[model samples]
Target: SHMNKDNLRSPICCILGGKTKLLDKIRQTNVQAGGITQQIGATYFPVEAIKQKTAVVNKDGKFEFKVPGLLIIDTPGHESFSNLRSRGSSLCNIAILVVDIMHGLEPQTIESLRLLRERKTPFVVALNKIDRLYGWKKIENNGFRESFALQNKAVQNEFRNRLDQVKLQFAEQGFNSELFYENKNFARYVSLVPTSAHTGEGIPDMLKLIVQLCQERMASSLMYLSELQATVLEVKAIEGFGVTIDVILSNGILREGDRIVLCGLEGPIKTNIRALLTPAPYIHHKEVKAAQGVKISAPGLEGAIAGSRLLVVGPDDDEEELEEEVESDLQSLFSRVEKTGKGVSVQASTLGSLEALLDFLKDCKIPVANVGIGPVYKRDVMQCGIMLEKAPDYAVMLCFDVKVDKEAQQYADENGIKIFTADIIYHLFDQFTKHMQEQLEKKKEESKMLAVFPCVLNPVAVFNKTNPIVVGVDVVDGQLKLNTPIAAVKMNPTTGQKEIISLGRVTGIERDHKPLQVCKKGQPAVAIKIEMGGHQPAYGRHLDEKDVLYSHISRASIDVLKQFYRDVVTTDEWQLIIKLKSVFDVQ
Candidate 1:
């Protein structure tokens, strides 16, 4: 069936969720529709912000539907790519959420679910990786139920457990989900099509379900509107072309040389589409209907933000008014970031990525002080330097898929400001968090050197109790160090009760005749010299064999340990600190 260019107008169906593998498999799969598929437009970005790829499915004799075919937007799967997910979902008539059956619902899949519900877009879930089951006999192109019947009993049982698990997860997310065969009311229950992306099983039925849902649920809205609804997917410099914008059009036709208004750094940018381009598929066409992807060559798009709404400037429409509206909308998107106060500095390559990073920081409760959409410059480093003085923890800058200028890197190093860079947002976040933890640990260690540690000791034998009493001791808990104030628990004969008495300070510690600075729990006994003021005690008089000694912890030192060393301190040490608070005047 050789269809004409008129068949190119099809309902847009966006492929979204956790990974690109499902989309790739589906794109490469030979459908029963007589093998008519065209990859319309695709772009390779240095960053994983959005994989701008589109494919058009043609309806042959075997593939019967009211609509000609479907235009698919294969969006990258990740929570970090939320902006692209948002744009794609908003523009598509329907969506297919690919969930790995073994993994259940992922963070990105949950995010896609929330977006789909919020936008009220009709979607069907593709439970991929069915062939990964233990003993599944893959029947190629078989529907989910047919394939289920072909599997062994153990494999069938495993499939049921996995399916029920997924259903439970969907229910937790507030959706009554069921298998495609059991889904009676599409409005009530979401359809889940079990598929093997590896073997192409259940793909035909998935397409049939999507087409049916489009006809039944989105019949009225399927017609293209007169007004143009388009969003900028990405702005990149092609090899031969100066600059081009990949756009996804949801409604209305986009012709060559149309005056367009797009959001810019300064304000709304007015430019003319010099040429409209698409991938040279098997069939050639110069026209771009609504609900598909197209590339446009235009000037004055240096700072165009991805995900910015674009409009075709009409002859009768007010151009200045549209520009003001666009400028206002873009500023509103960035207003979520903190313009002042304490927060980390963020820089990303595209507006989509910048907003996604900001959203990530917001979820983490890490406020962003400033944000930018280009290379990290010296000015960015200067802002971080100011934060170094104001808020040391937030003095760090995070660069997501963006370059740091040479001057910015040098200034950051000189000023002691931290800069973390990564192509993946999660990696960037993990690096910053790990770095902060290491800094905190280092601070605690430094404080330990200055503050007295809490420890308990037993005087095993008094070696020589004359000048600077030398005693071999056993470290009960916590770290023992030289120059630590010591306390002894002695029985007051008059009161007949035990009381803590200040013994003296430890002057020296010798382990096996070698001098040591610190000793910890689980170590062998060591000899320590105690220097008491004024009166010196006899062997069994002031200092007895049945006595316990402890390191005197000051109120100030205790405060330091509580504030800085809670995480680094051992469990035994923490217990000792709690005991010391009761015995000492911590107030």
Candidate 2:
């Protein structure tokens, strides 16, 4: 409370997790000492995909705690929109994790926790939507404890049950949390403020607790440092202005006509700021300060990437060192894509998104051969085409929140390359994995068409004795195909074992006086005309009534079977293959 006014800036805070409406409720809550001063950036619109935007609400103190104003940021709520959540966690001094009171913890909430822990950003959970509880009564403007005390016994019981469930849920995620009042120590446990954004309940308590936590614990980080630190939120075009960058200046002053360096798609972008604009405060710009969202008009910002770091260049600072800093920052991410490997090609809308997509792919056991920002172009399709021959499994391009070029689409169509596009990352992930399964099934079917099956036959009757020996044989196992080599095996009475006596090639197969190409195991009898090569087989000499015959599998054919038809073959067929491998000593 005793801090100097000239050195004071608002401690930045952000709301993440589920429900965009919850963010709106907090923005519109009457507990704000001053009404929302400025709310800018993108709005949540249900188009092809949910876009990431930031709304900063500047508010003066309303509670007893003495501190500077509050800069609250509302971020997008999609699980794949980790870029927004990550940037939010990284930039903000404190965070509010909104979890649905009824649903407890969701996938997005869990993901938000991971981001918060990674950044070491302290946060409080908002058990929002208590108004949606079963038979909940609306108590306008009263805090959670006061309103909860006035509820009926059953309602109170239900509320406690939901609270305990959420508390247990937090425990499972390795966080010890309790109700705000039940919290013994803020440093040791997380305080959860039960809130109903719709009814305006518990918001004042949430704000007071937040301000108290920040005032007591975050004094060092809340101090405004002279070293300028900013992060690019987005790059877009305005009506009067051509192209501008929206950045969140976390510390230090950024006035008009300042030299700055920003991370770009190509390299370090050094530019001079022409103008500074804030989102027109609700009460009109009485003043401006650090740790605020500002739009900058600058040249050479056309290729600026969202979620890149922005650094101010002082007159006395070394320009080369700042440029090198930006270069290494870009390299840390680009180097991952530059590494040569075998994986699906990926393209996204921003650097933050590219990293999140790559991380998800790694979790799914899918590697990335190439990665880039912006729409999918012909080069991406060409890379997939190259992967098509190198490894068909990796011959796919995954485009997240991006469009495929027209020529790239046509090229992919003609070259048999698959491109999966979706605004949501998981949807794109599902499409690629489903496509791979279909391809595997198709390859298996194609291999089955060219494979030769195994069969055993017994020569029960012999009709011809000369050049072509015609015999009626019963198919004992598997399938018999035309033009197959057959071996005549006889049992040696003295040795008490089976031995190969003669070899013959099947010239034709016929059943019911009609020529057949395949004879299955269950079919009625089929007659095969065999041509003996070296040892001619007479009816009672080489092939007797007790002798049995087997289809001979060559070593080369076995290799093909093992490679392409391993999962396609049946149990009996595989057993016969194993036996034949030993019988013929084939590898």
Candidate 3:
């Protein structure tokens, strides 16, 4: 007899606990049915083998298994996954952010949190590896009940203390979370489920909570099994099959003989299921209900995206209707692709040299957030910050041959945003290409110092040593090394003529007799002895008086000191007095 409503009280009671025995059975059935087994963490396997394996546990601690009403996609917790596009995929309807409770929230954990926010996907925190915590004991069979009877206050207190610490961490991250035991409805906003997937401890509670939450909040979506819709999890080119998509149908009924429309193919692909394949092949006309993973071998259709949507077109539908539906679907899918916007956002180091960067961007036309010179600034940082807020999926900063402000870089790091910079133009382009390609593969978003000014000497200043004048001062843009050459030059204000004077070392500061080579901006230094000492006036003498001193000393004596001070200082008493007196003298 068919297990109708009377026999099946609730489809909600899916088995997810106790060594995943039920899951193992399902896999065995698939394997026996000729479905190629695909290992979760390892290389792809035939559905048949995949059915035999309850779940594939990778060396890197990732696992993949499909449960009724659930498709668990296991991804690497690597830094690369932090990219915007990859993070988007990782943020499913109900994400289980498996965190190492003993380690608290790790870098990857924080990254996953940011991703969840990016996708606006609500998640349940799975505090995995709790067994690593000190004094943790596994509950064996009815041992949990026995332990409750023999409850030691000290042990209970210790457990509470640890949980409190974990809760505190979550609070710090702007999440109000509680242990599963404390709040039955914790999964509504935030939940903490402690489990050791290895020992299957607390696994049942975790699965139960997930199922309960879905039933309560997503029941309508979950149980709307009328439309045959599935998401393409992967696209593969089989050795014999040309192009195949690994799909997971969430709702609607998929029958062996049903015709379907592949949305993202080059054209409207009308395919009839040659066979219903899983880890093995099932018989003809078998119906695959909602929340089932099934691979169908159909004719036509190549190169579908992993996240493409598949819709059913009934076998009884007329050809004209099918054609119209296919065209409408194609138009919708193409519209979404067009609306996906540009790929990567690049900010070149030098705004002037953005031509090459723009050319590269033109080829791909990824969004260009900002372009500028010098190091990345607060504005670039702020743009990235806003992108993270506005379009977290498309936030990327690419700087070419520029350093970023330290504070701005920190903000990007905290937000899990990407910033790329390179010294060599080609290298920058190469890295940008590689980043884009990786984003396409994984489908991710690509989304420093002060120096001293030095003074230099002019040729005229070099010749005469006696009455030497300070002139030809040029501010070195970068760091000034000690004992570097310094020169001073004097310019004729009226005629725009310039003359070089004495060259000397930036020996020491006037305040403290400390030797130094570089003098920073907004600082003044005196060249010790004027080479033309006989012709120039004494230090601090007004330029006019110095001009008289120079006339008395030598006809070639030009008031270089006064000119140097005038050139360096904007509005000082000395400059005002000198300028007024010089004008008065001229008048």
Candidate 1 positional error at 16, Å: 5.7
The best-first sequence of candidates by lDDT reads 1, 2, 3
In order, the Cα lDDT scores of the candidates are 0.72, 0.70, 0.45
What is the TM-score ranking, best to worst?
2, 1, 3
Q: Which regions of candidate 2 deviate over 4 angstroms?
A: 1-9, 16-21, 28-36, 39-67, 75-90, 94-124, 132-139, 162-192, 212-223, 281-288, 318-320, 337-340, 443-471, 474-557, 560-587
Candidate 1, superposed: residue stretches over 4 Å from native: 1-11, 16-69, 75-88, 92-125, 129-140, 150-155, 161-191, 197-199, 212-223, 265-267, 282-287, 446-587
Error of 1 at 316 (Å): 2.8
| Winner of 1 and 3 under lDDT | 1
User: Can you write out model 3's per-residue Cα lDDT over 1-587, one digit (the tens) per residue?
Assistant: 22222111012212211223323322333234454333211112332343233222123323322223334433332211111232232214465666665666665566556545544455677665544545556553111223333445765566567778878887787777877667656434477776665554455456555545654565444433344556555555656556766565545677777777654434556677665555531323376654445666677756343444566765466755655653453243223222334343454332123434554455555555544434665666666666666665556776765567887788778877777786434456566667657756553221000111222221211212324433322222222234333333346799876544323333332213444444443354322222331344333442321221110111111233243334643344333334423433322
- Output the worst ten-in-a-row residue range by lDDT, candidate 1: 46-55
TM-score of 1: 0.64
Pick the TM-score winner.
2
Among all windows of 10 consecutive residues in model 3, the one with the lowest summed lDDT is 548-557
Summarize candidate 1's per-residue lDDT along 319-374 as a digit string, tens digits.
99888766665565567767567888888776566766776788788888877767
Task: Compare the candidates by lDDT and give the number of the best one.
Answer: 1
Per-residue alpha-carbon lDDT of model 2 for 293-340, expressed as tens digits?
767788888888777777778889987788777656546655665255
